[PDB]
């Protein structure tokens, strides 16, 4: 199935007493895997199986790199502010990562935002940066003038990130390659005089990705959609509802299809 690995960096200029100035966080699938921020100044695991399988020299090396990386972010956001003529507290954000599909295909991505909105979008396949405005274009020229650093990222997203991901996939395979089938249930009630609402609610399942919908008689048919939520124990839960011909909730999870017919 579809797995992922991303790394986030967040940099806040002029933070209040409790928000650290730098945060770096990495995820496999939903599960956070690494942590460092500008306060403890150490890279630490956030999953047991990250810590079980990586030696301390790993965290000693990536602590040094992350300390250095924070100093980059601080200067980078200082320079952004000056292009915009911006006093105050603004944010700089970076996301790099890659995907490996069930389909054998792979994507990779690298983007920056400033103040929470898209700023620079990398295209590893064309090896150029899509810039949102006249300021982002100025950085797009600097970055695109280093021919070698664009090949370097291209390779890191296409070769290094994928290999990291498969390493981390085997490490915690007992958690991320597992499958928790859902418990699905149909609830019917008459709400406003004359209006029956059917709720198909699913919970108890993992991975989070589930497919639920409503059909009438066998063909497709407006559907309010509930968000996939973390139950707390690390299973998930969701629902799809409609009102009101025969009707049936269809649920697809981890390749298994299930149908609940409303009587």
């Amino acid at each position, epitope marked *: 199935r579809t797995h992922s690995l991303r790394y986030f960096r967040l940099g806040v200029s002029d933070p209040i007493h409790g928000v650290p100035e730098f945060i770096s966080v990495g995820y496999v699938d939903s599960h956070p895997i690494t942590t460092y921020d500008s306060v403890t100044r150490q890279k630490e695991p956030r999953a047991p199986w990250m810590a079980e399988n990586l030696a301390p020299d*790993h965290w*000693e*090396r*990536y602590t*040094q*790199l992350l*300390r*250095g*990386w924070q*100093q*980059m972010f601080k200067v980078e956001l200082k320079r952004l502010q000056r292009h915009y003529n911006h006093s105050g507290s603004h944010t700089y954000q970076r996301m790099i990562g890659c995907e490996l599909l069930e389909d054998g295909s792979t994507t990779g991505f690298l983007q920056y935002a400033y103040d929470g909105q898209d700023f620079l979008i990398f295209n590893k396949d064309t090896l150029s940066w899509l810039a949102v405005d006249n300021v982002a274009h100025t950085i797009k020229q600097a970055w695109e003038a*280093n021919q*070698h*650093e664009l*090949l*370097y*990222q*291209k*390779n*890191w997203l296409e*070769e*290094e990130c994928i*290999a*990291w991901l498969k390493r981390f996939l085997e490490y915690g395979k007992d958690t991320l390659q597992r499958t928790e089938p859902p418990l699905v249930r149909v609830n019917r009630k008459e709400t406003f005089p004359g209006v029956t609402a059917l709720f198909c609610k699913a919970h108890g399942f993992y991975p989070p990705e589930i497919y639920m919908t409503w059909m009438k008689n066998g063909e497709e048919i407006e559907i309010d959609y509930g968000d996939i939520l973390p139950s707390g124990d690390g299973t998930y839960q969701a629902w799809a509802s409609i009102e009101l011909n025969l009707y049936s909730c269809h649920v697809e999870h981890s390749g298994v299809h299930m149908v609940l017919q409303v009587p």
Partner: antibody
Amino acid sequence: GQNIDQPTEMTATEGAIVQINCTYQTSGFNGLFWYQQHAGEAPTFLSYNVLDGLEEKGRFSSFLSRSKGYSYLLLKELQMKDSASYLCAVKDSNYQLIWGAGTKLIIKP
Amino acid sequence: VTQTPKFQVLKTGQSMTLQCAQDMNHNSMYWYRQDPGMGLRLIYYSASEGTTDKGEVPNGYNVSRLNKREFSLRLESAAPSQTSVYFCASSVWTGEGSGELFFGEGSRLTVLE
């Protein structure tokens, strides 16, 4: 674990062509550098390869093959000035450098 | 990069401090030693101002990253095994695949009994 093998010494003739090989069994890869270091001087950056290709600055050219796992540094129309050591080094998954022991090139007049 | 001294005679047990600095506005600085027939070997490095960490052959040495400019190496009790030629180097950052190394002229150390 991580080995870098390049020949110890090589000898070519002024005006000819030589090819220095750098074979790398690292774990992870983030590029391959070529440095020159004259007799008793510092090493200086020559070239960088991370994707399959061959780059050419002047009479020096750098070739990389990710599949078979080697690079070479190509020197055309050799001159006496090209006597030097040629250091090849690779970045691993964690961005450390693993250095080759170098290759000393002799240009016979 | 600029480093001093180019050469030094040392009596065993003496201490010595080797110096380095760059006005390239670089963030990383490294300290290598070059021994016959083997790679450059890292002693300590400084990923950016405010941190330092050991490298390959740290024993017998330590380092201080005085500021973004200067980074010095220190032999505590000079051993004959530390006779070598020492190299200081800076890169713009660390963890960028493309950025190369810029090297100082070298420092030839001779430890004698």
